[PDB]
């Protein structure tokens, strides 16, 4: 129970230069915002979303996969906590989506999500697009069932 001090230093762990630490901070913030929904936690969540946008602006594709596969259930946690912080989540989700789809377009692939549009161990951008659409599905099912 004496954990909610974490919101004091979660900005620092986000500002840490290591990718693994930034992923861990974002996941910790997600489960904190499930547990305690404070305006302090909301400000930290908004900071985290803008940080995630910044890393989207600046990260190459291999580390983009290695950073954006684990932190998407954190986004659905954010969206469960704060329905105000909702349009920002959807804008960031659509931006990460279409940039990964552009990568899939850049280099030749097989399973072809562009044809799959009307609905193992594969290529990283394929896995990332599948993760993105799965988290969108989870946001929608959440919001439907969540009263």
């Amino acid at each position: 129970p004496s954990m909610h001090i974490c919101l004091d230093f979660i900005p620092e762990l986000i500002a840490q230069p290591e990718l693994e630490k930034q992923i861990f901070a974002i996941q910790l913030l997600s489960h904190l915002c499930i547990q305690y929904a404070l305006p302090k936690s909301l400000s930290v969540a908004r900071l985290a979303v803008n940080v995630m946008g910044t890393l989207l602006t600046v990260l190459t594709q291999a580390k983009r996969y290695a950073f954006f596969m684990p932190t998407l259930p954190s986004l659905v946690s954010f969206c469960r906590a704060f329905p105000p912080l909702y349009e920002d989540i959807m804008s960031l989700l659509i931006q990460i989506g279409q940039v990964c789809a552009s990568d899939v377009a850049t280099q030749t692939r097989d399973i072809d999500p562009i044809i799959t549009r009307l609905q193992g161990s594969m290529d990283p951008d394929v896995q990332l697009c599948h993760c993105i659409e799965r988290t969108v599905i989870e946001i929608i099912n959440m919001s439907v069932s969540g009263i």
Partner: peptide
Amino acid sequence: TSPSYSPTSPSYSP
């Protein structure tokens, strides 16, 4: 800030 008193608890006034 208050590591042991939890956020959803009343303050102490003075």
